[PDB]
């Protein structure tokens, strides 16, 4: 399928973070985000380990699971912000974090931020010397932002 970038991919710590969107999708189980018919697009965070992820045991290019990913979508100049929890999921091209999304204020200029919280109690690390890792997770959320994203309707 055709995917459209929100902007250039960005590195943050051990992460390589890409943002893409395309047509709304059907998901199973359903009911987490908007239905395909109610949504404007499907939007996803492609989050993989870079070369630095080996400090935490990740191989380069590996999907990084158990993160807590939320998108903040704000029409430039608006006092309202949409906050959409992304869910981990597979498409035919592998794993992502994503959700079906509606741009509530219509076609126009938006700021899009992905907030990426570490797993917390959801993913552990061996820390002993014989089998453990010396890297550690981040305690404040990583925030990757693209400013002035232009939503001009379907591209498909």
130 annotated ligand binder: no
42 annotated ligand binder: yes
Strand order in the sheet with 142-151: 82-85, 68-75, 108-117, 142-151
Rounded to whole angstroms, the Cα distance separating 70 from 140 reads 14
Check: CB of residue 69 under 8 Å from CB of residue 86: yes
Rounded to whole angstroms, the Cα distance separating 127 from 109 reads 45
Q: What's the count of helices (H) and strands (E) in the chain, helices before strands?
A: 0, 10
| Sequence-separated (6 or more) residues with CB below 8 Å from residue 101 | 21, 33, 34, 39, 40, 41, 42, 43, 71, 73, 82, 84
68 annotated ligand binder: no
87 annotated ligand binder: no
Please name each of the domains of the chain with its CATH number: 4-151 (2.60.40.2480)
The structure was resolved to a resolution in Å of 1.8
Rounded to whole angstroms, the Cα distance separating 112 from 42 reads 14
Residue 32 to residues 36, 97, 129, Cα–Cα distance (Å): 12, 13, 41
């Amino acid at each position: 399928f055709d995917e459209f970038p929100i902007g250039d991919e960005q590195d943050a710590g051990i992460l390589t973070v890409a943002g893409v969107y395309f047509q709304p999708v059907d998901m199973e189980p359903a009911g987490n985000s908007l239905s395909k018919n109610e949504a404007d697009c499907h939007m996803e965070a492609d989050i993989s380990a870079n070369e630095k992820g080996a400090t935490l045991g990740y191989g380069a290019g590996d999907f990084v699971p158990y993160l807590h990913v939320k998108a903040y979508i704000q029409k430039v100049g608006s006092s309202k912000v949409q906050e959409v929890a992304f869910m981990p999921m597979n498409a035919s091209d592998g794993p992502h974090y994503g959700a079906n999304v509606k741009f509530e204020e219509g076609l126009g200029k938006y700021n899009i931020k992905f907030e990426i919280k570490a797993p917390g109690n959801d993913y552990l690390l061996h820390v002993d010397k014989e089998t453990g890792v010396t890297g550690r997770f981040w305690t404040e959320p990583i925030v990757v932002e693209w400013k002035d994203f232009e939503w001009t309707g379907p591209q498909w």
